[PDB]
Design a protein around this ligand. Structure first.
Ligand SMILES: Nc1ncnc2c1ncn2[C@@H]1OC(COP(=O)(O)OP(=O)(O)O)=C(OP(=O)(O)OP(=O)(O)O)C1=O
Ligand SMILES: [Mg+2]
Lengths: 1340, 600, 69
């Protein structure tokens, strides 16, 4: 056991030992991006691959070519912190080495000159942070990985619904990674059809003709030939004995001196037995048999040269004669069979209006570009471009794999484009499938759903960026002169940079981070989506794709999906799941060779799992790893049942591996209804982090894995001992074994301090190690928001009691002790960025001066001389943050107002008050001011105060770094210099800087001292550069938008306690809005005097069936028990042996757990530090499905001297009298969801109004009004509320005149409305009237 | 109009109007240039096209707007903007919203309005009422007063607030009860306080739901809100003359706990002068809330020609029902409370009060039923622990038995005795039966197994366990849901619609395992989707329904007809699926109805 | 059926609400059709008293002054 483990060990129940541990939870997001931006010296996906796809770019046969060499990423213009304050994107510039070649005119390719334009710049591509987010406009965004239909071929049904006859149709769809869609589909008549993209339907033989296939060859392609000989005289037929299966004779079928079947008896196996084994290849047939047969090839009259019968036409009995007498011995006909080999292509050719390649090419072109006339030069080139040009079409390797695999080919790899055989083989399968052999696939199997991510999707966007610079490159190469132009005058960066920018900025797969909370982050990054480009839209797809599918087992979570418009269109990655080599979903299993369960783990893609037999996670095995039971519940081919011991091939890796990170954090989940769990894992991410991080007494174990893997914490790079622990930073003196040879050094972690999140919440880290403490690699040096000692603490545990409380927890409401709001525990800190913008109006420029018209001297008191409030000043709503004044001249005043100007003699201002003022209702402390001034405007007074302070502050940071980093280097010079020449006291008398001169005898230590000097003088010099840069960033003229001259951002630290209206919930889908904040005295207290913190209604438990929340409240009660028991022995100060006796008892508890613990923990410092962290309650781990059992829960309650029933007798603090029946009390972890009421509350008497529709719009001051929709109108109609309705849609909204005749009448004291006509209808007059329609109002 | 940064925005019509003008002007030129007809014909065609894209773009080739891929919004689209586009809604002055919370202290006709919301909402009333009394010289200072929130504006706000109702509206406004008018009560904090009885009408939980507020400005709207939309003027649903202001849950548990009786309790057998001394016996710890007890009560009955005849007796009741009688108003029989009072019986109690005593005595009744219901429900200490969900001892027995039958149905299938379609069908039936067996096994145990003793050996009664009382009363919980906690929870359906032939043998008091929970998932997700979609289909129905009605109004007094439909009880196959008294109550007869004999 | 029965409304302003607004406006403008208001939907669209409830007394006093002197 380790160090942040010696502090606080969670007692974990559960039998099943974890064979595999949780992977790095953000792998999807970081591994994907890694491959987009990375020199990959091969064809693998990347920025390299997108380049090689469109490069080289040659001119229109001009023998002038522009090729690609290499690309580089610069360092970002600002750091991630600066990009958020300033408002910019965290991105790196893309420098791409190009080569321009010009070949000699009419000569064998040799270059006249070639200009190697060094790194032409094409756009900045955004960069992904250490944690998988992007900053796009000072806003953290995550790009959700996408689930689309896999590229390749896919055969669907379309059963039933088509044409109301049943029958079912069959479609094959060739779906590529890029390029046009090629669909083959049947019809009610068994005629074959093709449609490119989703265009018009065309007879499916046209695309074969366009591939240069004659009518004769197509027939030759899809049918076997039935040979008809005219031997001796009058009709024979070459017979395959197998041909007669499924048919009955039409005549005496006699051959070989033995009549096998007479006329009318169906040919069965006995007849095929006889014909086959007696080896009858030729027989005799009547002249009437070929009355319907379809002729295969063409035949002409030999002498005359005239056409007798065309290919694909049905012979008649006289037509037989018409070519029999013309000298034709053989006749080829088709093998047509409605059951076995259907005559589809034969009859399809008769619906085909075309006849040759050029004819087919034309009908394709005119279907694709209709209305406009086709050319031979166009019809040939368009068709070649749709599926055969390496540029306009590519399956990718994922497509060619799924393609060839589904056609039962052997290659997993091949052309990126379609060949003659590719297209034909798909038709050959779709026809075979209708013929009865073969099965369709299904859209919803996760082996035909595929997972993109950021890196892949970005590559596609940068691809589309190049294609539009390809158009421009060739455009210029059309005209170019020689040595004048260079690969720079051609390439335009704004089109490339805005394209890639639009992706990370605004995509249905790129979103905000609505609230900080290490689950929200980590669950968003593991999110999947079937939406956006390449996928379906909400309304297009029904419930079949949204549903949970047997493939989801261990790949996608069945529980954590949102409710609403895209249920099942999201999902979240299963814990142990992984993206396939090709991009499918794989899940871990354990190989079962014969009857032993191995620990060799195999990850199985969706298609792979189907054949095997996988055991269940809850399977009892012991000794050699034999299944204890004779037979185990297993799932194999799509479903689960009991199976034979020595027959299973695999076993689940973990009891968890079905659920997601969000689901895997719900304790006693197996006890919670799947409806309320979905809501549970949905509200869990919505927890705004609390002022003081608690830690869940009732936990599941994943608390560390979620906390650690999202960067909100600060984890040890290398192990060592703490040199210095500030509230600001942390210095770890690295251990030699983990320390690098040169430079030596110490790992220094600068902690994040109170800084703004993606609105409006805060993110602040705290050190969790004390001075001179040993840390190892992977320890938590500093918790973040909602982390305590390295565990996910999204809220705080509350002593809670289930009982009705005078209806103050009526529906699902919550009644809370004042002790909770006294203890500041559900307090929450928010940092709002409020900006102030001095712009450029046509009337003039705006000032930031602290001279404001018509405000008292006390109004300006909080302001400084320059007009900006002081740092640290506590402000409330209305207060002036930045005094700003805008020009408005020639006021055009009224008579009476001018008389007021002459009486009290006030110099009427040319300027209007536009100061940034604190929003009404909100209140907090100013903790930051930033000023960005457009380059050229002189930095004002306070702005220069800030520049000096920021400059001097950053000089302290950079130099404190150097000061600590010189010591760590020089300190190891001391150790190396002393070894072999020890001058213990003699050395540290001469100046320390003078040590570099001292050499050493023949040894590698002289090479080590040389190593440290090298990396020392760079630490000397890398300081100098890192200081200059931070200076240049502060003093540069901050680039602004048009018209804006300077901006002042004030950052407010609002501390928001808890109050009636705040939404709160535990982890089991138990919502609730706190309803009354109550005195500690009225709180139900127990016989001990200890009140309760929250009074929950019991009625919200049965109907809305979240039973796990109760076991939570009982095991939470036992957890607190063991805490107060430790707290007894600790305030009684027994001894380590008395403590260790009881602690060791609690960590064992029950039977057959996977825990194991101490006696080895060193008898003093260790046992005592552990007990202290437990006095608040002993944290417990209920695994997700390997959870604690009632007994182990009741047995923990006994150990704590608490009742097994988990219920006690409670007393009403009001009357003092006892409560009949025992109520439940215990500790339930409860969250605060960021639906805080002082955000949700809005009012508006009169406000602003929109220009076009004189309707309430809501900007500054009193907000927008409430919408009163059609359904609310019916309500008033169902009442008699005629007037209430009229005023609701006249004076109270659209009536520009009555609305102020109302406001004046209200203050006058006359509750009348003088209506008039809404503007909506008055505009409809002018809108109808400004069409050709005369609309009037009649009569009087 | 210009925007910030000096950038401009304009309606798309200007691209459309500009083009028509340009092509018209160019055509006017092409005539004075006497151009060849080949050109002017092409110009005329473009002028035709330009006008068409202005009036209704989309019925040709759909012109695109300048430099932007999107098409331009034509005049025709100014009117739509697809279907039902002029009646989507309009934002309104004098309004607001926030999260709503309880407030059980409220009378039926009131609601808690935040200090802050009521300030901003009535701003023009305060401004006037401020200088109407002279606390402000003029309106300009009046603003600066309520901006300063001087202590006196608060006392003024009560003046404007008193007889001035406000409107409350919750999200999906289904029937007319979705907007109800209440009298405002000035409350601290930012939450809206909602009377718990009107929750049922609104379909409001307190799990984060919000409501909106509106101010009746004109005198009419205040009287309309008071006489038509008031909370207490709509206590019956207009869909079925029954009360929509039923006690919901927390309260019906309270009354069911009161009007209950246990076999041997403190006070068993004493005789009390009246209901008053019965509350005195309970609040002093002498008599138990549920003990069989004779008390002298007086009840009233208006059997006279509109007059309350009194009758006094020693009725055979309990102590709790005695105390509840102190609330029942005047002319109701003591029999109405003498029973066990579940949500079933507790609403019909409320209905009869309206049909017998009238509106006002019903309103003040419902209040007292909630106050007392909440109080004694809170006194009850009703909770819910883990041991409250009692699994039958015979559960594992039933499972193995049906687990045996299926092993035999399988035995028959192996030998070709029974078909695969029969097997799947026959196996589902024995599992369906076993679930019914476990179900009414746990309910047999759960309901009555409280075996107690009175002066003698034994005697058992309806249980007093927490989770049973919740269901038996009707407050919360349903036997279908309870069955999923103690007994096994049903057979689940696999995605395609089949029901899975091995049901979920385990329940929620035990754990479900990976396989069971994974199968429980599809039902849950299709549950959330089905209930999400059927919330849409309904809303499209009420649209189609008001679109065919809307204009229909009670216009004439009596059309004067004898035509009418013959009303009978539905009597569906077995017995009366709906009585006659329900189908015919509240309707007016077409002609004289006669006894079994006539002349009469 | 209700949606087929709803399709037949005298007041074209009511029909231009929920039906296809082009066809209603055209087909009514060729007839020179007069909308008399009278109904609910349209009286809302134009911002006046509903011909029901408290407004029922108003329309009854209005429909009688009309077609009279
Ligand atoms: N009449 C209403 N009754 C009850 N609740 C309402 C009402 N209107 C809005 N809300 C809530 O207010 C926002 C949406 O408001 P809007 O649709 O965007 O419109 P406007 O911007 O103009 O306010 C949601 O609440 P939430 O954002 O908290 O999320 P939720 O929908 O899941 O409850 C709504 O429920
Ligand atoms: Mg709710």
């Amino acid at each position: 056991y380790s160090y942040t483990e010696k502090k606080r060990i969670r007692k974990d129940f559960g039998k099943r030992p974890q064979v595999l541990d949780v992977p790095y939870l953000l792998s999807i997001q970081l591994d994907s991006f890694q491959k987009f931006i990375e020199q990959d010296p091969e064809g693998q996906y990347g920025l390299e691959a997108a380049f090689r796809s469109v490069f080289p770019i040659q001119s229109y046969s001009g023998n002038s070519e522009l090729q690609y060499v290499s690309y580089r990423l610069g360092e970002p213009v600002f750091d991630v912190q600066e990009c958020q304050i300033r408002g910019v994107t965290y991105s790196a510039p893309l420098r791409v080495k190009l080569r321009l070649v010009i070949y000699e005119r009419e000569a064998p390719e040799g270059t006249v000159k070639d200009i190697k334009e060094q790194e032409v710049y094409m756009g900045e591509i955004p960069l992904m942070t250490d944690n998988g987010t992007f900053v796009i406009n000072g806003t953290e965004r995550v790009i959700v990985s996408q689930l689309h239909r896999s590229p390749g071929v896919f055969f669907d049904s379309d059963k039933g619904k088509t044409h109301s006859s049943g029958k079912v149709l069959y479609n094959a769809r060739i779906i590529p990674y890029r390029g046009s869609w090629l669909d083959f589909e049947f019809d009610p008549k068994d005629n074959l059809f093709v449609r490119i993209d989703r265009r018009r339907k065309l007879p499916a033989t046209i695309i074969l003709r366009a591939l240069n296939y004659t009518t004769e060859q197509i027939l030759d392609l899809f049918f076997e030939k039935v040979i008809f000989e005219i031997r001796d005289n009058k009709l024979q037929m070459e017979l395959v004995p197998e041909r007669l299966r499924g048919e009955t004779a039409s005549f005496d079928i006699e051959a070989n001196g033995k009549v096998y079947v007479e006329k009318g008896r169906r040919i069965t196996a006995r007849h095929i037995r006889q014909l086959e084994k007696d080896d009858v290849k030729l027989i005799e047939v009547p002249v009437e048999y070929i009355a319907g047969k379809v002729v295969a090839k063409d035949y002409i009259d030999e002498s005359t040269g005239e056409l007798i019968c065309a290919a694909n036409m049905e012979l008649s009995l006289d037509l037989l004669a018409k070519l029999s007498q013309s000298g034709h011995k053989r006749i080829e006909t088709l093998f047509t069979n409605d059951l076995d080999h259907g005559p589809y292509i034969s009859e399809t050719l008769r619906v085909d209006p075309t006849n040759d390649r050029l004819s087919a090419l034309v009908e394709i072109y005119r279907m694709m570009r209709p209305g406009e006339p086709p050319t031979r030069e166009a019809a040939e080139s368009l068709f070649e471009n749709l599926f055969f040009s390496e540029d306009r079409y590519d399956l990718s390797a994922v497509g060619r794999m799924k393609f060839n695999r589904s056609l039962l080919r052997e290659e997993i790899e091949g052309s990126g484009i379609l060949s003659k055989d590719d297209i034909i083989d798909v038709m050959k399968k779709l026809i075979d499938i209708r013929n009865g052999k073969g099965e369709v696939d299904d859209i919803d199997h996760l082996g035909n759903r595929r997972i993109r991510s950021v890196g892949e999707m970005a590559e596609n966007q940068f691809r589309v960026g190049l294609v539009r610079v390809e158009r421009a490159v060739k455009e210029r190469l059309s005209l170019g002169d020689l040595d004048t132009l260079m690969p720079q005058d051609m390439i335009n960066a704004k089109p490339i940079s805005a394209a890639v920018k639009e992706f990370f900025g605004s995509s249905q797969l790129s979103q905000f981070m609505d609230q900080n909370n290490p689950l929200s982050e980590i669950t968003y990054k593991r999110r999947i989506s079937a939406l956006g480009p390449g996928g379906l839209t909400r309304e297009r797809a029904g419930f079949e794709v949204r549903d949970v599918h047997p493939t989801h087992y261990g790949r996608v979570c069945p529980i954590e999906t949102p409710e609403g418009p895209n249920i099942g269109l999201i999902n979240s990655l299963s814990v142990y799941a992984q993206t396939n080599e090709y991009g499918f979903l794989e899940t871990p299993y354990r190989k079962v060779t014969d009857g032993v369960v191995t620990d060799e783990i195999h990850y199985l893609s969706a298609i792979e799992e189907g054949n095997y037999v996988i055991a269940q996670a809850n399977s009892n095995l012991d000794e050699e790893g034999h299944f204890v039971e004779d037979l185990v519940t297993c799932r194999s081919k799509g479903e689960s049942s009991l199976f034979s011991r020595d027959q299973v091939d695999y076993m689940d890796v973990s009891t968890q591996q079905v659920v997601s990170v969000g689901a895997s954090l719900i304790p006693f989940l197996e006890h919670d209804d799947a409806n309320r769990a979905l809501m549970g894992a949905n509200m869990q991410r919505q927890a705004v982090p609390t002022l003081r991080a608690d830690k869940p007494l009732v936990g599941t174990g994943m608390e560390r894995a979620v906390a650690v893997d999202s960067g909100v914490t600060a984890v040890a790079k290398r192990g060592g001992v703490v040199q210095y622990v500030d509230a600001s930073r942390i210095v770890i003196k690295v251990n030699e074994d983990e320390m690098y040879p040169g430079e030596a050094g110490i790992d220094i972690y600068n902690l994040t301090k109170y800084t703004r999140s993606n609105q409006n919440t805060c993110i602040n880290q705290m050190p969790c190690v004390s001075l001179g403490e040993p840390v190892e690699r992977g320890d938590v040096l500093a918790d973040g928001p909602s982390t305590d000692l390295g565990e996910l603490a999204l809220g705080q545990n509350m002593r809670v009691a289930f009982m009705p409380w005078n209806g103050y927890n009526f529906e699902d409401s919550i009644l809370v002790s004042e002790r909770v709001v006294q203890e500041d525990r559900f307090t929450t800190i928010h940092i709002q960025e409020l900006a102030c913008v001095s712009r450029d109006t046509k009337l003039g420029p705006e000032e930031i001066t602290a001279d404001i018209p018509n405000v008292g001297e006390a109004a300006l008191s909080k302001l400084d001389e320059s007009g900006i409030v002081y740092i640290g000043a506590e402000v409330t709503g209305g207060d002036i943050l930045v005094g700003k004044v805008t020009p408005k001249g020639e006021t055009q005043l009224t008579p009476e107002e001018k008389l007021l100007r002459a009486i009290f003699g006030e110099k009427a201002s040319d300027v209007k008050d536009s100061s940034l003022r604190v929003p009404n209702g909100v209140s907090g402390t100013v903790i930051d001011v930033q000023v960005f001034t457009r380059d050229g405007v002189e930095k004002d007074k306070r702005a220069l105060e800030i520049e000096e302070m920021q400059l001097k502050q950053a000089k302290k940071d950079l130099s404190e770094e150097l000061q600590i980093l010189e010591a760590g280097l020089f300190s190891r010079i001391r150790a190396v210099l002393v070894a072999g020449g020890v001058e213990a006291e003699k050395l540290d008398k001469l100046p320390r800087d003078r040590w570099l001169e001292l050499g050493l005898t023949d040894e590698e230590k002289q090479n080590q001292l040389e190593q440290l000097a090298e990396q020392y003088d760079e630490l000397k010099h890398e300081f100098e550069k890192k200081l200059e840069a931070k200076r240049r960033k502060i003093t540069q003229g901050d680039d602004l938008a048009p018209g804006v001259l300077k901006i002042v951002k004030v950052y407010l630290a609002v501390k928001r306690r808890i109050q009636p209206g705040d939404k709160m919930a535990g982890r089991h889908g138990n919502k609730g809005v706190i309803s009354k904040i109550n005195p500690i005295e009225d709180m139900p207290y127990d016989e001990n005097g200890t009140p309760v913190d929250i009074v929950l209604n019991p009625l919200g438990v049965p109907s809305r069936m979240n039973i796990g929340q109760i076991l939570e409240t009982h095991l939470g009660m036992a957890a607190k028990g063991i805490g107060d028991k430790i707290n007894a022995m600790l305030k009684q100060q027994q001894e380590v042996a008395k403590l260790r006796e009881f602690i060791q008892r609690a960590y064992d508890l029950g039977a057959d757990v996977r825990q194991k613990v101490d006696l080895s923990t060193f008898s003093d410092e260790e046992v005592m530090r552990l007990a202290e962290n437990l006095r608040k309650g002993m944290p417990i781990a209920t695994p997700v499905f390997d959870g604690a059992k009632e007994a182990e829960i009741k047995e923990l309650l006994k150990l704590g001297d608490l009742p097994t029933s988990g219920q006690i007798r409670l007393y009403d603090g009001r009357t003092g009298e006892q409560f009949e029946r025992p109520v439940t009390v215990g500790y339930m972890y409860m969250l605060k969801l960021n639906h805080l009421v002082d955000d949700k509350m809005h009012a508006r008497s009169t406000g602003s109004y929109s220009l076009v529709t004189q309707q309430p719009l809501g900007g500054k001051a009193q907000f927008g009004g409430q919408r009163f929709g059609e359904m609310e109108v019916w309500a008033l109609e169902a009442y008699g509320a005629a007037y209430t309705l009229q005023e609701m849609l006249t004076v109270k909204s659209d009536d520009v005149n009555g609305r102020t005749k109302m406001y004046k009448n209200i203050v006058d004291g006359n509750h009348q409305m003088e209506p008039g006509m809404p503007e909506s209808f008055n505009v409809l007059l002018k809108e109808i009237r400004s069409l050709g329609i005369n609309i009037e109002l009649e009569d009087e | 109009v210009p925007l910030d940064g000096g950038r401009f925005a304009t309606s798309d019509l200007n691209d459309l109007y500009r083009r028509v003008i340009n092509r018209n002007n160019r055509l006017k030129r092409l005539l004075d240039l006497a151009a060849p007809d080949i050109i002017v014909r092409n110009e005329k065609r473009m002028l035709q096209e330009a006008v068409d894209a202005l009036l209704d773009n989309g019925r040709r080739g759909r012109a695109i707007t300048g430099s932007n891929k999107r098409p331009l919004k034509s005049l025709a689209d100014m009117i739509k903007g697809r279907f039902r586009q002029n009646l989507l809604g309009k934002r309104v002055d004098y309004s607001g919203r926030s999260v709503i919370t309880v407030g059980p202290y409220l009378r039926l006709h009131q609601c808690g309005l935040p200090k802050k919301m009521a300030l901003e909402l009535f701003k023009p009333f305060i401004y006037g009422k401020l200088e109407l009394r002279g606390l402000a010289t003029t309106i300009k200072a009046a603003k600066k007063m309520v901006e300063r929130e001087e202590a006196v504006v608060w006392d003024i706000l009560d003046e404007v607030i008193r007889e001035h109702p406000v409107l409350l509206n919750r999200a999906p406004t289904l029937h007319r009860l979705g907007i109800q008018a209440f009298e405002p009560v000035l409350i601290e904090g930012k939450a809206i306080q909602l009377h718990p009885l009107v929750c049922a009408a609104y379909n409001a939980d307190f799990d984060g739901d919000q409501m909106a507020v509106h101010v009746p400005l004109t005198l009419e709207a205040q009287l309309e809100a008071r006489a038509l939309m008031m909370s207490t003027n709509n206590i019956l649903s207009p869909a079925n003359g029954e009360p929509i202001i039923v006690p919901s849950q927390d309260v019906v548990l309270g009354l069911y706990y009161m009007t209950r009786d246990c076999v041997n309790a403190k006070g068993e057998g004493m005789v009390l002068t009246g209901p008053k001394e019965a509350e005195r016996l309970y609040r002093s710890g002498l008599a138990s809330l549920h003990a069989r007890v004779k008390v002298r009560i007086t009840e009233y009955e208006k059997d006279a020609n509109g007059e309350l005849v009194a009758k006094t007796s020693l009725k055979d009741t309990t102590v709790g029902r005695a105390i509840l009688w102190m609330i029942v108003p005047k002319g109701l029989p003591y029999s109405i409370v003498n029973q066990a009072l579940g949500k079933k019986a507790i609403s019909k109690m409320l209905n009869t009060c309206y049909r017998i005593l009238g509106l006002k005595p019903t309103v003040i009744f419902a209040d007292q039923i909630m106050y007392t219901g909440f109080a004694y429900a809170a006194r009850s200490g009703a909770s819910v622990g883990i041991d409250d969900m009692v699994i039958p001892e015979k559960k594992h027995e039933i499972i193995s038995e049906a687990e045996a039958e299926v092993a035999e149905i399988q035995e028959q299938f192996q030998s070709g005795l029974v078909t695969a379609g029969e097997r799947y069908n026959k196996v589902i039936d024995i599992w369906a039966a076993a679930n019914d067996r476990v179900s009414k096994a746990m309910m047999d145990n759960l309901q009555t197994e409280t075996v107690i003793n009175r002066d003698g050996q034994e005697e058992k009664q309806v249980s007093f366990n927490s989770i049973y009382m919740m269901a038996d009363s009707g407050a919360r919980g349903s036997a279908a849901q309870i069955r999923q906690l103690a007994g096994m929870r049903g057979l689940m359906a696999k995605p395609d619609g089949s029901i899975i032939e091995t049901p979920i043998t385990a329940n929620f008091r035990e754990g479900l395992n990976v396989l069971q929970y994974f199968i429980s998932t599809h039902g849950a997700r299709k549950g959330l989707a089905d209930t999400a979609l059927k919330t849409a289909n309904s809303g499209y129905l009420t649209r189609r329904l008001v679109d065919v009605a809307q204009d229909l109004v009670v216009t004439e007094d009596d059309c004067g007809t004898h035509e009418g439909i013959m009303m009978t009880p539905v009597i569906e196959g077995g017995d009366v699926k709906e009585p006659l008294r329900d189908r015919v109550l509240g309707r007016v007869t077409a002609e004289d109805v006669l006894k079994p004999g006539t002349a009469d | 059926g209700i949606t087929k029965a709803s399709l037949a409304t005298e007041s074209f302003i009511s029909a231009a609400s929920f039906q296809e607004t082009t066809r209603v406006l055209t087909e009514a403008a060729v007839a020179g059709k007069r909308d008399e208001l009278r109904g609910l939907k349209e009286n809302v669209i134009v911002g006046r008293l509903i011909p029901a409830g408290t407004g029922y007394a108003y329309h009854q006093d209005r429909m009688r002054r009309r077609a009279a002197g």
